Amino acid sequence: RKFFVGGNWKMNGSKKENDKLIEMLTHAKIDPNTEVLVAPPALYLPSVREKLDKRFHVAAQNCYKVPSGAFTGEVSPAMLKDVGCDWVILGHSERRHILLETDQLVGEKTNHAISAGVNVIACIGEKLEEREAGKTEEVCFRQMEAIRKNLSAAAMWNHIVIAYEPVWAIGTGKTATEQQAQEVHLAVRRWMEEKVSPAVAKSIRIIYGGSVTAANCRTLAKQPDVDGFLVGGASLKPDFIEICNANA
Amino acid sequence: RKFFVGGNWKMNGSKKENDKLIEMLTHAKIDPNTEVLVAPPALYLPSVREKLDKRFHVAAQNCYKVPSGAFTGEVSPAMLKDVGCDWVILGHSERRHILLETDQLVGEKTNHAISAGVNVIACIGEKLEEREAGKTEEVCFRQMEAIRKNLSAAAMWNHIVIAYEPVWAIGTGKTATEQQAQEVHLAVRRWMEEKVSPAVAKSIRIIYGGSVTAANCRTLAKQPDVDGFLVGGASLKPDFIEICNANA
């Protein structure tokens, strides 16, 4: 499986700061076997894509589930393709838990994006009260099942990267270990093996979307079922390059 | 009060179709006393603003309530200003009722946008069961109060245009007359007079956001408390020009 590192800029960006990050990526020495993605705010998607080498993927941080219509404030996969972008992050914990997106909506969006030629980082993960009730797997599997049920063709799994987010470690004073990450990633892969196929399970990338830093990235990357990262705050800093090189 | 016509493109747009609409607007004969605004999808905001003369306002279809942070998929007023856009639509019925935005969230966004130098089209309106139960004023006033309570000073109303959306007439087989529109607009203006000030009530624009067509726009515009329109589907068509000229 090809190592995969995505930088989620979240709601951070400006022409001036974007240019600084683009220059950092342009001059960086990165393992050529690593897939690298950045996700700027939607206003900046066309310009960042124009300015950045195709070696780097440029992803939207959200999209909707039809090509056009009466959905004020939403953008469609067709629009992403129109400005040269073929990736999107869907189901991020901030969109599920702050902006109230349901499991079914995430699955509908994932099917539609892939049908339009946009690859998907599909995010899953459990909250602290769910983890404490022993429902880590029950929650993650329910989120995955909502994606699976909504896909329209078996090949769509070739266009998905799964990101596990330990939401229970965000603003709770709890911290996740690399062993805890590996245990969830392995459980998710075995769900793929049982519910989809062993062939998809062996080839799909499952990336870790908790706190990823220059200090912890190598111990996370060496875990056998952790295939890369969806990076938060460190994607805005020179540390992102060290994280891209965590597998080498 | 200066007549105000906004075109909400909703989730419609592409480089090619945007160029056609921009060429239509650039060469159109429009009443010079009308304020005209267009609101493209967020991906296209920088390009549409660059290509359209400053005579036209260019608005985002949504934004968030702080300048930056961990809000994947959201954009801030500072980003809008960074690409030259100084207007936003907030509280549109599609965002309230499909994407689940609360009264309080709309008020928080409105205050923050104005504090950052972005003017706001603030949308209100009641659904069919609410109107049939006699709650038109109760609902509209509740939505207005959530904005009022969250503003930092009464002077911020000078950066607001109120749009009344008869959501009860959107896709229900019910239709609104110009008399029904005038009745609600008058009730909203009298709320402004009592809860804010007569000076603001007499100067704030209250625009109609129901079905607006080339055929009905002149009869709506002549109502004394209807100050313009927030146009939907007709904003993508040459009919938009006739609607911009409804007051002349």
End-to-end Cα distance of chain A: 14 Å
Number of discrete domains of chain A:
1
Query: Which geometry of chain A do the CA atoms define?
Result: globular
Summarize the biggest pleated sheet of chain A: 8 strands, parallel
Largest interface: A-B, 40 and 41 residues
Instruction: Output the helix-strand order of chain A.
Output: EHEHEHEHHEHHEHHEHEH
At the third CATH level, what is the topology name of chain A? TIM Barrel
Q: Report the structural category of chain A.
A: alpha/beta
PDB class: isomerase
Keywords: Tim-barrel, Triosephosphate isomerase, isomerase
Assembly: dimeric
Entry title: Crystal Structure of Triosephosphate isomerase SADsubAAA mutant from Opisthorchis viverrini
Explain the overall architecture.
Two copies of one chain form a homodimer. The first copy, chain A, is of the alpha/beta class. Chain A has a single domain (1-248), classed as TIM Barrel (Alpha-Beta Barrel), CATH 3.20.20. The first copy, chain A, is built from eleven helices and eight strands. Chain A has an eight-stranded parallel beta sheet with strand order 7-6-5-4-3-2-1-8. In chain A, helix 7 (136-150) crosses helix 8 (178-195). The longest helix of chain A has 18 residues, at 178-195. The two termini of chain A are 14 Å apart. The interface between A and B is large, with 40 and 41 residues. Chains A, B: InterPro entries: Aldolase_TIM, TIM_sf, TrioseP_Isoase_bac/euk, Triosephosphate_isomerase, Triosephosphate_isomerase_AS. Chains A, B: It holds the Pfam family TIM. Chains A, B: This is Triosephosphate isomerase. Chains A, B: It catalyses: D-glyceraldehyde 3-phosphate = dihydroxyacetone phosphate.
